[PDB]
Amino acid sequence: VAQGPNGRALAESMNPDLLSAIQQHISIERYASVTYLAMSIWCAERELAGFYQFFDGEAKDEQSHAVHFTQYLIARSQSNDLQTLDAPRQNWDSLASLMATAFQMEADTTSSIQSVYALAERNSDTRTTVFLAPLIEAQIQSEDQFAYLLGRVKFANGDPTALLVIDNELRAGQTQRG
Amino acid sequence: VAQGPNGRALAESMNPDLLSAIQQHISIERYASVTYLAMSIWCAERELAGFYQFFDGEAKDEQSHAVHFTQYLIARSQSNDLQTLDAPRQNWDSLASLMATAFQMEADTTSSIQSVYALAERNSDTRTTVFLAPLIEAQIQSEDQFAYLLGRVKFANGDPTALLVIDNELRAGQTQRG
Amino acid sequence: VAQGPNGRALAESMNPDLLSAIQQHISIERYASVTYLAMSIWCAERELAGFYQFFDGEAKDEQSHAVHFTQYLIARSQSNDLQTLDAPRQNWDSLASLMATAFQMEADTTSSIQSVYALAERNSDTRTTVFLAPLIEAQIQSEDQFAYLLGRVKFANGDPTALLVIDNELRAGQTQRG
Amino acid sequence: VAQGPNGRALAESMNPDLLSAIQQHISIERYASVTYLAMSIWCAERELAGFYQFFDGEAKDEQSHAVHFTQYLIARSQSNDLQTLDAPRQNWDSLASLMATAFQMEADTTSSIQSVYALAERNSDTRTTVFLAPLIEAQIQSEDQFAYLLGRVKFANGDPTALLVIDNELRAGQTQRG
Ligand SMILES: [Cl-]
Ligand SMILES: [Cl-]
Ligand SMILES: [Cl-]
Ligand SMILES: [Cl-]
Ligand SMILES: [Fe+3]
Ligand SMILES: [Fe+3]
Ligand SMILES: [Fe+3]
Ligand SMILES: [Fe+3]
Ligand SMILES: [Fe+3]
Ligand SMILES: [Fe+3]
Ligand SMILES: [Fe+3]
Ligand SMILES: [Fe+3]
């Protein structure tokens, strides 16, 4: 039995380029987490308590997703490399602009997973493509959800009354089409 | 004992014109079903999740109504003839215009039942007039319901804020006067 | 953020050939649904009440599968295009011949999904291949189930007594190997 | 306030021809009851215990239907006239022949109600047409049920094994398509 780079027994070696791609994807999820924290704060500063609660939860969930990837590297006997985390964006001119950034961040998270998937496919690392499939499935639902929240906020057309109604929906947990 | 056209024992023969009228009415209900599916999709595309849920349910209910008619033909030992189904309308300029089409479709469904009823009356097929009576009763309630939804949406006068409030009513199941 | 063809925020563009393939596959599932309805009627006309109940349920389930695909297109910000639906086959000389058509229809449904899968793979649309995987898994179970029902009916060798016994199995919900 | 022929206060006079038609229809239902009793006995004599139990129940139900009509005449302040009851048929060469007689008797019961309905319509006695409508509705279900039992017995094609299986269905209460 051989030992992997993190010292555990090695079931199958992993290409270094794929390892680097997974490590950078963990950074993407960690950055999405702190971005959602920054969004939760922006919303709290404007008394949008439902949006604040929603994004506070999204920040915790994104961190959980990042940790899920760290556990996969442990399972593959690969080293983790927790990286420097950039400061998030913290200023937006409107809730609609913030929700646009949130949607783009969710789509960019999926793009990063897709890139890891394609590299695993090129390397015939089917443990990794199988591992990623349910995460891509979850990303489809998150993209559908964030397109719903963004589109509903844009429908409000900047009317505070409509934005208060949507804020109360989010506080109640009404956060997707259902 | 004689055998009916579908091969079962025949309680009483049915005029071929009335049979054709029932078969075409089944098509009307099947078409209403796919129209409500198209409406549910249009609403989902615009994040009107309550209207989407409402019309998704109406599509299933209209299909159930169609199947109820197929069972009546079986009970009368008559052949069914499931027909080609036209593509539904799929584009509307506004929720108010969609709800107008929905109301007209419900009224047109009743008109079709009324036409079958009148033909059964002319043929003294009292099994069929008796069978249709509770369906007409249900259509009165559906017309009242769709006049309520259409009128409430028109009252909103295209204001997104009012339409979000009504959307949330429908998501909660608040879909008639009560 | 860009807008997709159905107007929602677009996470990732979809090749038009793949969109057309998904739209036509929705038609395949809708056609399977109305075919199972026609089969349920054929069975009811011959007092095969268990087969009638089974196919009545299969018709509703196939429609649900079609709607599941419409929701995926909404999630991808793609337009749906609900198509004209052909009339189903409605005449069979025997239950064995009907079950053969049912099996072939289930296998043909899988073939259609496989074709969409292959096209998504060629386009590196991993959202779609991931989305389709559990549906293919479900199709394996449906093919196993319909091979079981067809084979059990063929084992009966046209004996009414054996067909009544199997009919009662289906009424009781005994519809697969288990 | 006027008094009706049975001595009670009279809400609305009834044409004597319609009264006679209702009184003779009560005889039709009473005769159906004793016919089902005779059928239950024929089945018991051949150890078809499920068919015996089914027809024993049908005899009681048909009597209840007859009494329901006697109550309507009381409600209309009309006299009842309980008539001589013919002896039922008691001999059949086969279960299939008995079930054919049973189906014809059910259809003949509906025909009798239809004839009363048509006469009430000609006399504009809308109390009576309204009273009869749910009874015609129930007759549609009974005709569907007896076409199912007759057709299933004919499918057996005289095989004792198949007839034992159907007999056990009836004992279990499995008496319609469901
Ligand atoms: Cl805004
Ligand atoms: Cl509107
Ligand atoms: Cl067969
Ligand atoms: Cl027989
Ligand atoms: Fe994530
Ligand atoms: Fe995310
Ligand atoms: Fe309807
Ligand atoms: Fe309707
Ligand atoms: Fe399917
Ligand atoms: Fe299928
Ligand atoms: Fe009766
Ligand atoms: Fe009867």
Domain boundaries, chain B: 1-178
- State whether residue B138 sits within 8 Å of chain A by CB: no
User: Position of tokens 């593959």?
Assistant: A76
Cα–Cα nearest to C40, from D71, D178, B101, B17: D178
Q: Which helix (H) or strand (E) holds D159?
A: none
The partner residue sitting opposite A162, judged by closest CB among B44, B160, B171, is B160
Q: Under 8 Å CB-to-CB from A61, ≥6 apart: which residues?
A: none
Per DSSP (E only), the strands in D129-173 are: none
Q: What is the DSSP code (8-state) at residue C7?
A: S
Partners of A9 in beta bridges: A3
| Entry resolution (Å) | 1.6
The C-alpha atoms of residue C69 and residue A79 are separated, in whole angstroms, by: 40
User: Position of tokens 């609900």?
Assistant: C82
Residue B120 region by backbone torsions, left for phi larger than 0, else alpha for psi between -120 and 50, else beta:
alpha
The C-alpha atoms of residue D148 and residue D102 are separated, in whole angstroms, by: 12
The C-alpha atoms of residue C65 and residue C139 are separated, in whole angstroms, by: 11
Q: How was this structure determined?
A: X-ray
Cα–Cα nearest to B68, from B109, B115, B11: B109
User: Position of tokens 């953020």?
Assistant: C1
The C-alpha atoms of residue B167 and residue A177 are separated, in whole angstroms, by: 11
Q: Do D100 and B8 make contact, defined as CB atoms within 8 angstroms? A: no
The C-alpha atoms of residue B165 and residue B133 are separated, in whole angstroms, by: 36
Partners of B3 in beta bridges: B9
Q: Report in angstroms the alpha-carbon separations of D55 from A63, C90, D147, D166, D173.
A: 70, 35, 15, 14, 12
Both tokens of residue B164?
Answer: 């979000």
For A12, phi and psi rounded to 5 degrees? -160, 135
The Cβ of residue C66 has, within 10 Å, a number of other Cβ atoms equal to 20
- State whether residue C77 sits within 8 Å of chain A by CB: yes
Cα–Cα nearest to A177, from B161, C134, B45: B45
Cα–Cα nearest to C101, from C67, C146, C152: C146
Contacts 24+ apart (CB under 8 A), B105-112: B105/B32, B105/B35, B105/B36, B106/B32, B106/B139, B106/B142, B106/B143, B106/B146, B107/B143, B108/B28, B109/B28, B109/B29, B109/B32, B109/B139, B109/B142, B110/B136, B110/B139, B110/B140, B110/B142, B110/B143, B112/B24, B112/B25, B112/B28
- State whether residue B67 sits within 8 Å of chain C by CB: yes
Comparing alpha-carbon positions, the chain B residue that sits nearest to D98 is B1
Mutate: best of A161, A168, A171, A175, partner B, most B CBs <10 A: A161
| 3-state secondary structure at position B3 | strand
User: Position of tokens 């009919």?
Assistant: C167
Per the CB < 8 A criterion, the answer to whether B48 and B163 are in contact is yes
Contacts of A146 in chain B (CB under 8 A): none
The C-alpha atoms of residue B141 and residue B138 are separated, in whole angstroms, by: 5
The C-alpha atoms of residue B141 and residue B101 are separated, in whole angstroms, by: 17
Q: Do B85 and C56 make contact, defined as CB atoms within 8 angstroms? A: no
Q: What is the DSSP code (8-state) at residue C93?
A: S
User: Position of tokens 């024929």?
Assistant: D42
Per the CB < 8 A criterion, the answer to whether A62 and A29 are in contact is yes
User: Position of tokens 């009339």?
Assistant: C87
